[PDB]
Amino acid sequence: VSMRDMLKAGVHFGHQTRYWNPKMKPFIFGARNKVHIINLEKTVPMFNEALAELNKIASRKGKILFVGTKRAASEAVKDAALSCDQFFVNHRWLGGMLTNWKTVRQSIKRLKDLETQSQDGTFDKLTKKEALMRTRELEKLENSLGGIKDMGGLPDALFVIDADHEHIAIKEANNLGIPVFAIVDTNSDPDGVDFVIPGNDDAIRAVTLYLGAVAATVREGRSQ
Amino acid sequence: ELQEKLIAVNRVSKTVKGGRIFSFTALTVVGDGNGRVGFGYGKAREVPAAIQKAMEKARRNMINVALNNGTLQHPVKGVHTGSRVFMQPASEGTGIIAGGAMRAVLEVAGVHNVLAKAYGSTNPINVVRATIDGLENMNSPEMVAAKRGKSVEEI
Amino acid sequence: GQKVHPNGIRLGIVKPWNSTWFANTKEFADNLDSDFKVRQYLTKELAKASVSRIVIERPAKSIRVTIHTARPGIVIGKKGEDVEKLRKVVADIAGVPAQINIAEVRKPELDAKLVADSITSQLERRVMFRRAMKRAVQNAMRLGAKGIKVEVSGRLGGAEIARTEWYREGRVPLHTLRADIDYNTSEAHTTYGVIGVKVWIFKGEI
RNA sequence: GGCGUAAAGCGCACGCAGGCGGUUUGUUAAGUCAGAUGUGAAAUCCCCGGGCUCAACCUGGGAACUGCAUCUGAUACUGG
RNA sequence: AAGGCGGCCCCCUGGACGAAGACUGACGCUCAGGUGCGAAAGCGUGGGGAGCAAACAGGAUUAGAUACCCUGGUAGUCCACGCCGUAAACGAUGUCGACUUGGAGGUUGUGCCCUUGAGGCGUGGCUUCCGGAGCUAACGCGUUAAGUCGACCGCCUGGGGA
RNA sequence: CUGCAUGGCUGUCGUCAGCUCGUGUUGUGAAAUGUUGGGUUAAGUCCCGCAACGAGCGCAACCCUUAUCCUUUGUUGCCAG
Ligand SMILES: [K+]
Ligand SMILES: [K+]
Ligand SMILES: [K+]
Ligand SMILES: [K+]
Ligand SMILES: [K+]
Ligand SMILES: [K+]
Ligand SMILES: [K+]
Ligand SMILES: [K+]
Ligand SMILES: [K+]
Ligand SMILES: [K+]
Ligand SMILES: [K+]
Ligand SMILES: [Mg+2]
Ligand SMILES: [Mg+2]
Ligand SMILES: [Mg+2]
Ligand SMILES: [Mg+2]
Ligand SMILES: [Mg+2]
Ligand SMILES: [Mg+2]
Ligand SMILES: [Mg+2]
Ligand SMILES: [Mg+2]
Ligand SMILES: [Mg+2]
Ligand SMILES: [Mg+2]
Ligand SMILES: [Mg+2]
Ligand SMILES: [Mg+2]
Ligand SMILES: [Mg+2]
Ligand SMILES: [Mg+2]
Ligand SMILES: [Mg+2]
Ligand SMILES: [Mg+2]
Ligand SMILES: [Mg+2]
Ligand SMILES: [Mg+2]
Ligand SMILES: [Mg+2]
Ligand SMILES: [Mg+2]
Ligand SMILES: [Mg+2]
Ligand SMILES: [Mg+2]
Ligand SMILES: [Mg+2]
Ligand SMILES: [Mg+2]
Ligand SMILES: [Mg+2]
Ligand SMILES: [Mg+2]
Ligand SMILES: [Mg+2]
Ligand SMILES: [Mg+2]
Ligand SMILES: [Mg+2]
Numbered sequence: 001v002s003m004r005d006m007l008k009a010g011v012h013f014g015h016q017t018r019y020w021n022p023k024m025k026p027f028i029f030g031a032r033n034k035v036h037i038i039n040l041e042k043t044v045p046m047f048n049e050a051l052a053e054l055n056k057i058a059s060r061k062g063k064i065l066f067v068g069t070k071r072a073a074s075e076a077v078k079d080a081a082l083s084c085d086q087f088f089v090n091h092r093w094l095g096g097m098l099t100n101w102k103t104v105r106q107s108i109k110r111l112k113d114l115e116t117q118s119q120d121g122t123f124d125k126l127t128k129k130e131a132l133m134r135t136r137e138l139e140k141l142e143n144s145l146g147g148i149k150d151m152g153g154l155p156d157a158l159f160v161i162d163a164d165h166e167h168i169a170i171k172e173a174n175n176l177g178i179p180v181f182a183i184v185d186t187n188s189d190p191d192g193v194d195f196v197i198p199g200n201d202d203a204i205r206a207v208t209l210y211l212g213a214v215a216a217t218v219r220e221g222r223s224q
Numbered sequence: 225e226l227q228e229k230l231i232a233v234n235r236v237s238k239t240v241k242g243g244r245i246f247s248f249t250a251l252t253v254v255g256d257g258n259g260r261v262g263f264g265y266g267k268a269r270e271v272p273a274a275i276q277k278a279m280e281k282a283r284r285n286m287i288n289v290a291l292n293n294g295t296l297q298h299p300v301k302g303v304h305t306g307s308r309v310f311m312q313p314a315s316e317g318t319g320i321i322a323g324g325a326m327r328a329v330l331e332v333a334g335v336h337n338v339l340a341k342a343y344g345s346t347n348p349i350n351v352v353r354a355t356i357d358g359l360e361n362m363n364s365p366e367m368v369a370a371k372r373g374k375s376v377e378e379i
Numbered sequence: 380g381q382k383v384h385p386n387g388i389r390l391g392i393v394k395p396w397n398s399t400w401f402a403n404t405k406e407f408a409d410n411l412d413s414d415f416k417v418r419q420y421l422t423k424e425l426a427k428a429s430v431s432r433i434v435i436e437r438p439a440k441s442i443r444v445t446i447h448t449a450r451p452g453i454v455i456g457k458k459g460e461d462v463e464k465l466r467k468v469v470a471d472i473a474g475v476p477a478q479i480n481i482a483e484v485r486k487p488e489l490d491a492k493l494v495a496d497s498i499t500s501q502l503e504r505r506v507m508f509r510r511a512m513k514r515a516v517q518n519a520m521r522l523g524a525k526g527i528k529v530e531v532s533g534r535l536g537g538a539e540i541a542r543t544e545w546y547r548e549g550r551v552p553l554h555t556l557r558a559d560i561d562y563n564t565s566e567a568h569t570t571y572g573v574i575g576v577k578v579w580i581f582k583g584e585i
Numbered sequence: 586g587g588c589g590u591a592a593a594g595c596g597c598a599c600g601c602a603g604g605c606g607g608u609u610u611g612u613u614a615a616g617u618c619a620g621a622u623g624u625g626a627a628a629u630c631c632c633c634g635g636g637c638u639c640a641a642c643c644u645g646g647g648a649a650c651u652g653c654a655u656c657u658g659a660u661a662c663u664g665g
Numbered sequence: 666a667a668g669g670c671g672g673c674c675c676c677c678u679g680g681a682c683g684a685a686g687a688c689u690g691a692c693g694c695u696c697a698g699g700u701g702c703g704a705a706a707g708c709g710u711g712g713g714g715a716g717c718a719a720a721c722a723g724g725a726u727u728a729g730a731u732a733c734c735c736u737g738g739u740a741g742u743c744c745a746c747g748c749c750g751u752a753a754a755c756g757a758u759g760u761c762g763a764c765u766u767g768g769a770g771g772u773u774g775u776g777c778c779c780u781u782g783a784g785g786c787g788u789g790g791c792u793u794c795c796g797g798a799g800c801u802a803a804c805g806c807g808u809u810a811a812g813u814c815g816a817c818c819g820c821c822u823g824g825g826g827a
Numbered sequence: 828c829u830g831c832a833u834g835g836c837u838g839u840c841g842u843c844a845g846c847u848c849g850u851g852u853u854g855u856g857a858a859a860u861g862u863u864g865g866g867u868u869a870a871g872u873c874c875c876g877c878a879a880c881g882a883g884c885g886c887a888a889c890c891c892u893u894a895u896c897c898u899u900u901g902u903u904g905c906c907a908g
Contacts, residue, residue: 022766022797095878100851103880168878171852236857240846249857267858269848305802305855345802350855381837392890526883533833541833550883556890566834573834584889586822589758589811590804593821596703596754597667600696605816607691802855 001047001213003040009206011199012038014186021189027198028186036186038198050181050195051217054157057179058221062156065148066211067169069093073161073207080211081147084219087155088147089169097145098172101154108149111141157181159214162201164188183210228254228279229328232348233271250274251349254282255332261359262286263329263352287356290364294336297365302358306345309354314339325351333359385553385562385579392556393585400437410437413473417444420472421465428453431484431492443478444469449487488518491563491578498529498576499567508535508574512546519580526550526581533574550581557584 006012014020014028014036029039058064066088068077074090081088089097097104115138117123142149158173160166160182170192173180182193185201200206232251237244248271255261264282268274290297296313303309309326314337320330322340325348330338342351369375386394402410414435421433421444432447448454455462462479470477487493494515501511512529519527526549533541552558559582567574 018768020767025766092877094880096851096880100880103850106881168852175852238858242846247857265856307855347855353855380839380841388890539832547883552884554885555888558889564835568834572832575834588819588821589756589806591802592823593819594757594759595819596750596752597701598703599666599699599701601699603696604818605695606693 003044005209006040006043009209010203011043011206012040013200014038019187021187023189023191024184024186024198038186038200043197043199047197050197051214054181054214055217055221057157058218059224063087063151064157064159064218065089065155066159067166068161070162070165072204076204076207076211080215084215085222086218087151090147091144093169094144095168098154098176107141108145111149114138161207162188163193226254226256227332228252229332230275231325231328248274250278251352252278252282253328253332253352254279257332257334259289259291259334260286261289261329261333261356263356265349287360289333289359291334296338297362300358300362302354304350304353304357306347307350307354308343309351309358311338311340311358326355329355385560389556389560393559397432398435416472417469421446425454429487429493431490441475441477442473443480445480445482447482447484449484449493451481451483454481486522488522489524489580491561491580494519495563495565495576495578499565502567502574503569516546516548520548524549524580525583528579530577531574534571537571551579555584559583
C-alpha cells in the first residue's frame, strides 16, 4: 500500500469541520468545503508500522478480532475475517464481550449445543412449538457472536474501524491490555488506540483496501 | 505469597416499599511486601462474601512503588476528595508512624520506616486512595536522571 | 403469604402416599390411629438410625411396614435380633400380626427429612446456624440435585428477637406440579426455645 | 485554612495614607550574603567523659544560646 | 460603575469601540479611614390627582375568616426641592494583569477578493448556549473559570440567644 | 401468665405483577445499570433497540372439573329393531 490507491479510495476525506476532535490536529492537512482533509504522508508509515506488528503478532499465532458493525462496512469485515482465518464482530458489540468472557462463554456453549442438535442432531421433534423459537434463537445468537464461536479464549489484538462508534470495545481492550489497531476518522479520539491510522471510514472502498491489505498481511503471517 | 489486610467493614442500608435492606461493605488491601500494592472494595448481603469480593478485586488493581530499602525516596503528598496525606522517609529503626488506614497500606507495601500525617477527612476509603496516589507519584533517582538526561552523583 | 404443602399438592400426580390400605368407614379411624401409634414408635426408638420414610401397607388382616433408612445396619442390627424386637412389638401395637421390610436410601444428602434432621441435630449441639445451612446446601448440590433451599426460623443464636433466615441454590419451581420436589420439616428444641427448619430439594420434572 | 450553594466578597464607584512596581545602563551599598572581632553571666537543655555498689543526683570539657553592635569584602536580586 | 434606562423632535452633556498614523515616556494597579452615587417603600414643604390601590367599609365563603374572591375606597403612586441609605441591592462569584484544547449563535466596527446577489477569505469590541483538560464534597464551572499564577483589599471561625 | 421470648398454622395488601442475584461496567461513596426506551400483552407477555451479558423466585403451561367425538366393557344401568 502506498499513496495513490489511498487517494483514489478517498482515504483523505474527513467528516465536516464542525464535528472534529482537537486531539487529531496533527493528522489534518487542511480544509476544503469546510471538510477536513486527512494527511496522507502521515498515514502511510504508521499504517505500514501497524501492518508490521500485526504480521509479527500473526506468526507468533495470535488470534485477531476484527471489529466493524456499521451497516455499510460489516460484510466487508466478515469477508476479510474468514478470508484470513481470524475472528470478527459484524453485528452489535455486546457490552462486556472481553471483560465478561466468563459469562458469554456460556452463550457460545448454548450456540454450539443447539447447532449440533440443529441438523446433525436432526431431531425435528417439533412439539407444535419449537421450530419458530429454536431456529430464531440460533439466528439471534450466531448473528451477534457467530464470528467469535471458535475463539476459545481472549484474543491477541483488536483491529478497529471507526474508533468512536466502537468506544466500548476499545475501552474493554484497554482495560484487558490487548493492543488496539483503529482507523481514526477526523471526529474520533485516538487516546485509547496504541497504533493510530488516520483515514476515512465512512466510504466502503477505504474500508475495502484497509481490510484487504490487513487480511493479506496476516495470511502471510500464518504463512511464515 | 501476598499479605492481605482487612481495614474496614461497614453496614449500609437502602429503603424499599417493604422497609430497610441492609448490606455489608468491606475495604481491604493486599501487597507483596516488596513494592506492590492494591486496594479492594466489595459489597454483599453478608460479610464474608463482601470480604472475598474485596480481596478478589484487590489481587487485580495492583500498582508498583519504588522503595529505598524499606522507606520512601522523598517526602510526598497525596490527595483525594477530602483526604490530604503527607508521608516522609525516616531513618532505620523508626517503624511505621501512621494512622489506622495508612498503616495497613504501608505495612503490606513493604515500607518499614516513615513518618506520616493525615489532614482533612480520615474516611478510610479516601485515605487509602490518597496514600496509594501519593506512593505512585513518587519517583526514584534513576528515573529523575533519565528525565533530565544526566546521571549525576545525586543518585 | 402462606404456601400450600408441596407434598400434599402433588399426591397422586408424582408423589405417592405413605399408607396404601383400604377400609370402609367402619375400621378407618382405628386403622388410622394404630398407624399413628406404629409411626410414633418407629420414629422414637429408631431416633439415631436415620429413618426417612415409613410406608405402612395393610393386606387382608395384617400389616407390613417398610422403613426407608440411610443406615440400614443399625435397624437390621447384629445378625437381625432388631427387626424381631421391632415386629414383635408392632404386631403388639396394631393387634394384627406384622411384617417388616427395610429399604436403603443410598444418598442421604438428597432427602429433605435427613437433611432437616442433620441441621436440627447440629443446632442442638450449639453450632452456628449459618454453617449448618451452607454445608447442607453445598453437600446437596455437589451430588446432582437440581435445586435446594433451606430455611431456619426462631431465636437464632439465642437472640431475643426471632428471625427467619433462608438459603437457596439452583432451581426450586414450587408452582410446577410436574416438579420432583422433596420437602420436609424438623424442629430443634434448644435452651432458648424451638427452632424450625424446612428443606426443599428439587431433582427434576415429571 | 477558607468565602457560587456549608459561616464568609462591602450595593457600586472615586480616592489620600499604606502595600506593590515593565525594561536598559551607570552609580551607591540601605536590605541581603560571606568572613572576622566584641558580647550573648553561672546554672538549665544536648554530646563525649568522670564520681557515688547502679539509678536519680553531683561533676570536667565541648556544643548551643537561633540575637545585637562594629569592621572588612561581595553586587545577582530589592531599595535610593 | 452599580441602582437603572423604552413614542417622536430639539438644546446641553458623559462614556465605549474601530482604522491608519503622530505624540508623552512608567505618568501604573489596589486601597483602611474619607467622599460621592444608590430600586421600592417611607418622611418634610408646595403643587397635581385619570387609572390603580395599603388602611377602611360593605357583600360573600367559612366552624370562625380581622384572609384569599366581589363592590367601593383614602394615603401613596406623578412633579419641584430636600431627607432617608436599605433589598434574594444576585452571577448569592471584589478589582487589576498574564497564561491554558474546541463548537454553534447574536450584535457592533473594519481589511481583502470576479463587490457579479441576501457571495467567499481575514481581523477587533461586547454578548448567549454547549462542552475538553483541569478543578470541585457533589451539583456543577469551564478562555466572560469556580483552571494555572501574581498584587492589593473586604470578610468567616458550631447552632440558638442575636 | 407472657403470641412483645418461640415453633407450627392462618388472615392481609393480592392472583396485585412484581422481587432479586452472579459476573461486567459507571460513581470517592450510599448506590446505579441490567429491570429504562419504541411497540404489544391479562402478564417483567413477547419482539426490536440498548454497557450490559445471563440466571432465580413469581406470570404462562403441567393438575381437577365442565362442553364434542371415537374405542373397550355391559349389571343392579339402557330399550332402537
Ligand atoms: K457621545
Ligand atoms: K471603605
Ligand atoms: K378597585
Ligand atoms: K373551614
Ligand atoms: K387617591
Ligand atoms: K437578576
Ligand atoms: K455523583
Ligand atoms: K475592598
Ligand atoms: K455557644
Ligand atoms: K407465630
Ligand atoms: K451487579
Ligand atoms: Mg475550613
Ligand atoms: Mg442558606
Ligand atoms: Mg452561606
Ligand atoms: Mg458584588
Ligand atoms: Mg451598605
Ligand atoms: Mg492610598
Ligand atoms: Mg497610595
Ligand atoms: Mg522592577
Ligand atoms: Mg516603592
Ligand atoms: Mg549592606
Ligand atoms: Mg560510673
Ligand atoms: Mg537597581
Ligand atoms: Mg418612591
Ligand atoms: Mg410625599
Ligand atoms: Mg402632598
Ligand atoms: Mg380590593
Ligand atoms: Mg404615614
Ligand atoms: Mg428628592
Ligand atoms: Mg445588606
Ligand atoms: Mg436587581
Ligand atoms: Mg452578599
Ligand atoms: Mg468569573
Ligand atoms: Mg478603584
Ligand atoms: Mg459548560
Ligand atoms: Mg454562637
Ligand atoms: Mg423493580
Ligand atoms: Mg433503570
Ligand atoms: Mg418472564
Ligand atoms: Mg432491554
